[PDB]
Design a protein around this ligand. Structure first.
Ligand SMILES: CS(=O)(=O)c1ccc(Oc2cc3nc(-c4ccccn4)[nH]c3cc2CN2C(=O)CCC2=O)cc1
Ligand SMILES: OC[C@H]1O[C@H](O)[C@H](O)[C@@H](O)[C@@H]1O
Ligand code: NA
Length: 446
């Protein structure tokens, strides 16, 4: 029975409360000196602090590295009503070559600095020496707002000899070893951090950032006294939970399915990022693919016959998941996806594939809701407030564009967060505006 195979994806409320409590426990472990180093949830102080210690105005360069495409953009920051407006003015996107991303650090950052030029020249501006904000969507141990070493690549990145190294250095070398231009690199932030920062003008309650895109992560404003790895008890600092690695010490073992185990084993980073592998768009289409393969090996789908493409890793794209679940019921979208994959599905084949899609994506919404509710309830407790009103800034294609993910996600987080009133804001150019606003504050020292 297909329903019996799909039922393995369900999570009961008690399963979610369990996931939630365990996440809260790992978050606490990551923050404490005695456990931070062994912690699966690393809880990385980011050096982004509360209060407006003045902001510079003008134009800022923003880099965005964290997918196969790299982005360079210009953001103009200025003074006003609530404070500082920000707006992307010029933007250019760049694909990284196959052998550039598998090259070396020094090399990849050369392709990156090269790309900064194709943008600088192509916009009448190689002569400018701009402040630079770098959104870099990989786990970094910060020493400061402008200094921090990459702990490891995630999401299938692999450039050699980049791990263990100050990432801002690597970038300032490619800037020297280019002669071309001069840029001052003032801040490196995680994408979660940028997204939250980008909503803060519109909403001063925005103190969490969450990405549900290719990967899955969040950050939030922690009490400085709770942040044991930075001296000081005063104010708040932003903590990059890196919750993607929740489960890398076995915390999700009772939930993982044969599909999860296979995605993990054939991944670039086996044994790591296990929570993220349940949720992120890098993995969601692959999960459905494996579920489809299981259904077929059992003769419950495509009369037990799978195409060449269907048996290939990566072929069931995450965007297909989202398109399958947008089908209006006439099966046209489903049929056209499958047919392109060299399949000839029946009416019941289409409906099964839809069901497989719903199961994978519902489980990602719910699994993700437990992570966030854990963050929100911790913060409600830390701040000692009765009804906590909080805004979460959110970005990522899974959340923004999968037709039912956001609604299932919001319903499930609200269920797990009594006495919290959560406002969700989808960020508008969160990466670039976010890196720009941090930059503009980091430009009060210099
Ligand atoms: C004027 S305004 O009110 O429109 C306005 C003000 C700030 C804005 O972004 C920020 C930039 C920052 N740069 C640093 C930094 C940088 C270096 C060292 C230490 N700190 N910290 C920052 C905090 C924020 C805002 N911030 C919070 O305070 C809680 C959640 C959040 O996003 C956005 C709009
Ligand atoms: O892009 C979302 C997330 O992807 C992975 O989880 C990265 O390790 C993390 O830094 C990033 O925030
Ligand atoms: Na502290």
């Amino acid at each position: 029975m297909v329903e019996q195979i799909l039922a393995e994806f369900q999570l009961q409320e008690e399963d979610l409360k369990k996931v939630m409590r365990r996440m809260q426990k790992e978050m606490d472990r990551g923050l404490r000196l005695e456990t931070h180093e062994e912690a699966s949830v690393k809880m990385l102080p980011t050096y982004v602090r509360s209060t407006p210690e003045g902001s510079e105005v003008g134009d800022f360069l923003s880099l965005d590295l964290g997918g196969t495409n790299f982005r360079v953009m210009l953001v103009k920051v200025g003074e006003g009503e609530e404070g500082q407006w920000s707006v992307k003015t010029k933007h250019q996107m760049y694909s990284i070559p196959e052998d550039a991303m598998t090259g070396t650090a020094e090399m990849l950052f050369d392709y990156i600095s090269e790309c900064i030029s194709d943008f600088l020249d192509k916009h009448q501006m190689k002569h400018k020496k701009l402040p630079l904000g770098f959104t870099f969507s990989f786990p970094v141990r910060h020493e400061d707002i402008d200094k921090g070493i990459l702990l490891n690549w995630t999401k299938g990145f692999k450039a050699s000899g980049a791990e263990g190294n100050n990432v801002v250095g690597l970038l300032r070398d490619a800037i020297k070893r280019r002669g071309d231009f001069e840029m001052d690199v003032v801040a490196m932030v995680n994408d979660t951090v940028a997204t939250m920062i980008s909503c803060y003008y519109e909403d001063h309650q925005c103190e969490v950032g969450m990405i549900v895109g290719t990967g899955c992560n969040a950050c939030y404003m922690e009490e400085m006294q709770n942040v044991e790895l930075v001296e000081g008890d005063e104010g708040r600092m932003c903590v990059n939970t890196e919750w993607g690695a929740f489960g890398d010490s076995g915390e999700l073992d009772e939930f993982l399915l044969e599909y999860d185990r296979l995605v993990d084993e054939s991944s670039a980073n086996p044994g790591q990022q296990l929570y993220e592998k349940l949720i992120g768009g890098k993995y969601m289409g692959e999960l459905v693919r494996l579920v489809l393969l299981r259904l077929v090996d059992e003769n419950l789908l495509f009369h037990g016959e799978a195409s060449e493409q269907l048996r290939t890793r990566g072929a069931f794209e995450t965007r297909f998941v989202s398109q399958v679940e947008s089908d209006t019921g006439d099966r046209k979208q489903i049929y056209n996806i499958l047919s392109t994959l060299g399949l000839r599905p029946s009416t019941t084949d289409c409906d099964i594939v839809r069901r497989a899609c719903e199961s994978v994506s519902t489980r990602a919404a719910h699994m993700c809701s437990a992570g966030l509710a854990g963050v929100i309830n911790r913060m409600r407790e830390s701040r000692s407030e009765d009804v906590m009103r909080i805004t979460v800034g959110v970005d990522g294609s899974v959340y923004k564009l999968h037709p039912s993910f956001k609604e299932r996600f919001h319903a499930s987080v609200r269920r797990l967060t009594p006495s919290c009133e959560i406002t969700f804001i989808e960020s508008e150019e969160g990466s670039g505006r976010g890196a720009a606003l941090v930059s503009a504050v980091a430009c009060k020292k210099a």
